[PDB]
Design a protein around this ligand. Structure first.
Ligand code: HEM
Length: 315
């Protein structure tokens, strides 16, 4: 996949295959995402309400308060791992983000957490019960419904939960990358957790690509695209651009600065994702002097970069 990106960056940065436009290089990838006037995400107050809530619940002071909870949750999750043979995705990568968002949203843990995680009129009742939890715990969108406002809140709740899949993938991708390149001891001894997670974001981005729609007739590079044309933007490719990232195919855990476009356009749950991953790796690296990878299964999706299974043995 990345060899294809290399050649396309070299020979056709902006490319039309007959069906859809595709962008591979960093400069043009960045331009498409940031130039929101020319390139649309459609095909805003709901977005602004999301941004307003993200400020409230993902503030630096709120996340700094949660650090100890996240650590103990992580620590508790690792205790249920079988050192001889066990799945990292099932035991750590999937649970931690859901437990942490459940603490933030105020979703019920324990017996209801098993049932609520798994989840028309019976479903609708649970959907309203779900909203009721967040309503009770909390922000503009919570207070405004304390029917369109109710659906708006329900929609944002689903988003805030759903986004944690990429965080799950980042943890898994990090474990794979640090193990294959044998970086654990180095990251541990040199305190590269922060940068190594960012390098894992650049190198193994949970979201491989995104789409934009041309608002007007625009020109990018040598090419010129018309209105109503969908522009595929390969984030994974942009992250390996040689001009921006020297030795772009190399995994450098102390790479700094690392202006990857893995989060896209500011992304709301990025500080949260980073924190969860940082603490996940830190606590995990403490329990394992040695990590052997036995079996892996990728997620069957061209858009997402992650693992359905990651079976490991620990010392
Ligand atoms: C490693 C973790 C994550 C990665 C790599 C990631 C990546 C992305 C990317 C690439 C986009 C598309 C943005 C664009 O097209 O410009 C996106 C959108 C979004 N992500 Fe994430 N994401 C992560 C975690 C989360 C989390 C934890 C949440 C919520 C709790 C979240 C909520 C969203 C939402 C709501 C959108 C659409 C609206 C927006 O861009 O603000 N994501 N994400």
């Amino acid at each position: 996949m990345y060899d294809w990106f290399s050649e396309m960056r070299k020979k056709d940065p902006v490319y039309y295959d007959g069906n859809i436009w595709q962008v591979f290089s960093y400069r043009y990838t960045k331009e498409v995402l940031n130039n929101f006037s020319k390139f649309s995400s459609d095909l805003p107050p709901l977005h602004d309400e999301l941004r307003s809530m993200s400020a409230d619940i993902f503030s630096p002071q709120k996340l700094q308060t949660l650090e100890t909870f996240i650590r103990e949750t992580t620590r508790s999750l690792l205790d249920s791992i079988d050192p001889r043979e066990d799945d990292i995705v099932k035991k750590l990568a999937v649970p931690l983000p859901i437990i942490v968002i459940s603490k933030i949203l105020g979703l019920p843990i324990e017996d209801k957490e098993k049932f609520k995680e798994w989840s028309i009129f019976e479903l609708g009742k649970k959907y309203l019960e779900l909203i009721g939890y967040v309503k009770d715990h909390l922000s503009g969108t919570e207070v405004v419904s304390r029917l369109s406002d109710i659906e708006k809140l329900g929609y944002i709740i689903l988003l805030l939960i759903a986004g944690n899949e990429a965080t799950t993938n980042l943890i898994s991708n990090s474990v794979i990358d640090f193990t294959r390149f044998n970086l654990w001891q180095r990251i541990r001894e040199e305190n590269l957790y922060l940068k190594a997670i960012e390098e894992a974001l650049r190198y193994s981005p949970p979201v491989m690509r995104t789409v934009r729609k041309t608002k007007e007739r625009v020109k990018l590079g040598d090419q010129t695209i018309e209105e109503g044309e969908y522009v595929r933007v390969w984030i994974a490719s942009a992250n390996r651009d040689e001009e921006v990232f020297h030795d772009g195919e190399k995994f450098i855990p102390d790479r700094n600065p690392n202006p990857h476009l893995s989060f896209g356009s500011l992304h709301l749950g990025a500080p949260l994702a980073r924190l969860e991953a940082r603490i996940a790796i830190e606590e995990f690296s403490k329990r394992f002097r040695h990590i052997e990878i036995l079996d892996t299964e990728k997620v069957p999706n061209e858009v997402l970069n992650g693992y359905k299974r990651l079976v490991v043995r620990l010392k």
